RNA sequence: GGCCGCCGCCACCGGGGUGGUCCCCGGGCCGGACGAUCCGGCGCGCCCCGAGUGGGGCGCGGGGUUCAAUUCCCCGCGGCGGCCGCCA
RNA sequence: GGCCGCCGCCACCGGGGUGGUCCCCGGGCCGGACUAGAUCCGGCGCGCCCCGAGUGGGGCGCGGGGUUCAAUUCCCCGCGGCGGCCGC
């Protein structure tokens, strides 16, 4: 069967590169897989503007959503907030597909390094900040626990990852009358105990009086709430 | 004014993507919200190509353009080899009553092969030659397919001029749904007088076997009569038609 | 490219009407008498008279019905919508 | 990361309800009835104590404290399990 693979990690950690390589190995193992991320649409605009984010976010989600109907989808996005990963998981749940969160990690050193090597189009200060605010996968919710944690400073074994993911895709993602009688007879008993201030010994009789009464009732086939309750009220009035 | 759909068309390696980015940049400096979209966005998200992904690719790409045109100028960076493809892109713009301009980019087979080689010949040169050979320039069969601009991408391109021309055109009223404006009509009484005076004129022409000359006077006699009547406020159909019959009788 | 539905082929543009040589409503422009207003008009082609660069005549894809076709009928070309085919 | 919360601590398991000494629902298992069946009847955990020392019977308790005539329920603390919204 097929699944939703959710990457998470800071800008420059290697999400996009890891995505392409993962997809390529999967393709060799005979799987139809597509790589999606908010960046596809975000970079389609010639400049950045806060006001495009809504459309960017909505459109990326529609593509992911429509793609998971027929293909494995690798979501290549920073996904720094747990609520963002929750949102992606809701798509998998909706289609009853399995999902795996893959957390790519790297020291802040490497991150700043790589960011400089890219023209620091994202200011290093913002990178530092994001590293601090990042939501550690699984620290808050079991559903957020990373299927794998990848160290992008060391070599990566895609065949092994593929193998594990393929196995995971084969798992099963699972994700009147009577009570009325009990409820109400309980109310009546409390009403009665109040109106007569019975003693410790006489209340116990009333309790037992109700147990015996209820037990007898669950024996008869035809039972009408209102009529049974009336029978109970008068049983107490003459006891 | 408002926003429009810019449709690019031209063979692989002609420079569509490069032209797209530059045009999008200039438009942006000119205060326009524009996005660049093409089937490649989705096609290259797959690690391999398979003909069965194409339906999805097409469905996905059109949905994006469609939803984006509600809010932004859309530049479509796709080969758009066939007119029916450009037609489908126009129907999106008609769906939202937005202007559109087909921009046709060309270059000699000479440059296309060279550039195709410099790209590792992912597309066999043979295919490039053939595509180039069978390609029908836009506008050769349909008027709605006539390019707004034809750009030689081997020559210098002036993006400010183009941007300028594009902005002007966005400020025009599309000839899409000006075909449903069923109004500016006269009240039933007026139209009833037009219709009836027309039949009376015909009845009269018959009863007196007029010649081409004498008929023209009757026609002008009707024109002058209706003109005068639409100047009065209170008009009774039956009364007016009698006045017209008599006007003809003492002619 | 094929099938079906519908519309255009009256001529500044849009819409509408119509067996009257077109007409109506809104928009545009030109001319004229008087500058608003009012009155006349508007494309293309062929011919003719004129001699000055104007006036007039015939025509508007083909054919039919008819005194008369923009209108009705058959065919041709084109538009729009629907459905199929095409789509390195 | 912030704010908040749900579930269990009634006792085969899971879900639900409930100030009445617990109950309802689904599943499971044990014993009996049953010319493999199904249905019907009875029942189910841990701890300490007692008669018997019989694969038997009875008693009391169910993390601690509080409100109570009565707590599975409600408040507070404890242990174990899990989530929501928002941070965009
Ligand atoms: N596994 C790796 N080891 C070392 N360098 C890497 C590795 N993966 C990627 N890089 C380099 O790190 C830089 C950024 O890689 P990239 O995959 O674009 O990160 P990203 O997380 O997708 N970035 P962003 O899209 O901005 O969040 C480039 O120089 C990559 O070549
Ligand atoms: N105006 C230009 N002058 C010189 N080279 C150009 C020009 N435009 C594009 N190129 C180059 O031609 C090659 C392809 O350009 P590109 O804009 O990607 O063409 P394309 O039509 O988008 N190709 P494709 O996506 O395969 O249909 C690259 O080397 C471009 O830099
Ligand atoms: Mg990336
Ligand atoms: Mg391109």
CATH of the domain at B11: 3.40.50.300
> CA Rg, chain B, in Å?
29
Residue B50: CB atoms within 10 Å: 9
H or E element that contains B86: helix B83-95
Q: Which ligand minimizes its atom distance to the CA of A13?
A: 1
How many whole angstroms separate alpha carbon A59 and alpha carbon B191?
52
- If asked whether residues A191 and A113 sit together in one domain, one would say no
Name the residue range of residue B220's domain: 188-251
- If asked whether residues A157 and A211 sit together in one domain, one would say no
Query: The domain that contains A203 carries what CATH number?
Result: 1.10.12.40
- If asked whether residues B215 and B125 sit together in one domain, one would say no
Phi-psi map region of A228: left, alpha, beta (phi>0 left; psi -120 to 50 alpha): alpha
Structure tokens at B24: 């999008």
Residue B247 falls within a domain, yes or no?
A: yes
Residue B38: CB atoms within 10 Å: 22
Final residue before a domain boundary, out of B172, B196, B219: B172
Final residue before a domain boundary, out of A130, A155, A176: A176
Residue B10 falls within a domain, yes or no?
A: yes
How many whole angstroms separate alpha carbon A143 and alpha carbon A175?
10
- If asked whether residues B98 and B214 sit together in one domain, one would say no
Main-chain phi, psi angles of A155, to 5 degrees: -70, 155
Q: Which residues contact A146 (CB under 8 A, 6 or more apart)?
A: A8, A101, A102, A103, A137, A138
How many whole angstroms separate alpha carbon A210 and alpha carbon A182?
9
Residue B181 falls within a domain, yes or no?
A: no
Q: Please list, residue by residue across A80-102, b when 16 or more beta carbons sit within 10 angstroms of its beta carbon and e when fewer do.
A: bebebbeebbebbeeeebbbbbb
Closest of B77, B80, B93, B2 to residue B40, by C-alpha: B77
- If asked whether residues A108 and A151 sit together in one domain, one would say yes
End-to-end CA distance of chain B: 56
CA distance B38 to chain A (A): 10
- If asked whether residues B206 and B156 sit together in one domain, one would say no
Exposed, middle or buried: residue B141 (CB in 10 Å: 0-12, 13-18, 19+)?
A: exposed
- If asked whether residues A158 and A238 sit together in one domain, one would say no
Q: What long-range pairs does B224-230 form, CB within 8 A, spacing at least 24?
A: B225/B197, B226/B193, B226/B194, B226/B197, B229/B193, B230/B186, B230/B190
Residue B210 falls within a domain, yes or no?
A: yes
How many whole angstroms separate alpha carbon A38 and alpha carbon A54?
11
Structure tokens at A28: 């060799």
Chain A touched by B50 (CB under 8 Å): yes
Residue B179 falls within a domain, yes or no?
A: no
Resolution, Å (one decimal): 2.4
Closest of B81, B82, B2, B6 to residue B37, by C-alpha: B6
- Find tokens 């002609």 and name the residue: B14
> Which residues on neighbouring strands pair with residue A98, listed in sequence order?
A3
Residue B177 falls within a domain, yes or no?
A: no
Chain A touched by B18 (CB under 8 Å): no
How many whole angstroms separate alpha carbon B242 and alpha carbon B229?
13
- If asked whether residues A34 and A91 sit together in one domain, one would say yes
- If asked whether residues B153 and B224 sit together in one domain, one would say no
Exp. method: X-ray
Final residue before a domain boundary, out of A176, A204, A229: A176
CA distance B26 to chain A (A): 9
Q: Is the CB of B231 under 7 A from strand C?
A: no
**Cβ contact (<8 Å) for B48 and A70?**
no
- Scanning A13-116, the segments in alpha helix (DSSP H) are 15-28, 38-42, 53-67, 82-94, 108-116
Q: Which residues contact A35 (CB under 8 A, 6 or more apart)?
A: A19, A20, A23, A73, A74, A76, B45, B46, B47
Residue B7: CB atoms within 10 Å: 27
Atom 23 in ligand 1: which residue has the minimum CA distance? A12
Residue B33 falls within a domain, yes or no?
A: yes
Residue B154 falls within a domain, yes or no?
A: yes
Phi-psi map region of A238: left, alpha, beta (phi>0 left; psi -120 to 50 alpha): alpha
Structure tokens at B234: 């209170």
- If asked whether residues B131 and B226 sit together in one domain, one would say no
Consult the annotation and say whether A7 binds a ligand: no
How many whole angstroms separate alpha carbon A87 and alpha carbon A8?
13
Closest of A52, A33, A226 to residue B67, by C-alpha: A52
- If asked whether residues B123 and B245 sit together in one domain, one would say no
- If asked whether residues B161 and B203 sit together in one domain, one would say no
Question: Distance (Å) from CA B7 to C1' C86?
Answer: 20
User: Where would I find the beta strands (DSSP E) of chain B?
Assistant: 4-9, 34-37, 73-76, 99-106, 149-152
Structure tokens at B72: 């932004």
Compute the distance from residue A28 Cα to the ligand 4 centre, in Å. Answer: 27
How many whole angstroms separate alpha carbon B194 and alpha carbon B226?
7
**Number of domains chain B is built from:** 2
């Amino acid at each position: 069967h097929h699944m939703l693979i959710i990457l998470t990690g800071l800008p420059g950690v290697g999400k996009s590169t890891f995505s392409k390589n993962l997809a390529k190995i999967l393709s060799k193992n005979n799987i139809d897989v597509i790589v999606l991320g908010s960046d596809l649409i975000r970079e389609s605009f010639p400049v950045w503007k806060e006001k495009y984010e809504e459309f960017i976010k909505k459109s990326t989600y529609r593509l992911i959503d429509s793609a998971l109907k027929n293909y494995w989808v690798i979501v290549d996005d920073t996904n720094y907030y747990n609520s963002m990963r929750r949102d992606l998981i809701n798509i998998a749940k909706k289609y009853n597909k399995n999902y795996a969160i893959i957390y790519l990690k790297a020291s802040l050193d490497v991150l700043i390094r790589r960011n400089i090597e890219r023209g620091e189009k994202i200011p290093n200060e913002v990178i530092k900040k994001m590293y601090e605010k990042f939501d550690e996968p699984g620290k808050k919710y079991k559903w957020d626990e990373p299927f794998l944690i990848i160290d992008t400073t060391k070599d990566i074994d895609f065949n092994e990852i593929a193998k594990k993911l393929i196995e995971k895709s084969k798992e099963i993602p699972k994700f009147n009358i009577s009570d009325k009688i009990d409820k109400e007879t309980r109310k009546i008993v409390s009403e009665y105990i109040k109106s007569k201030k019975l003693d410790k010994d006489k209340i116990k009789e009333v309790v037992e009086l109700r147990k015996e009464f209820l037990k007898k009732i669950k024996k008869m086939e035809e039972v009408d709430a209102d009529r049974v309750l009336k029978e109970f009220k008068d049983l107490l009035n003459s006891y």
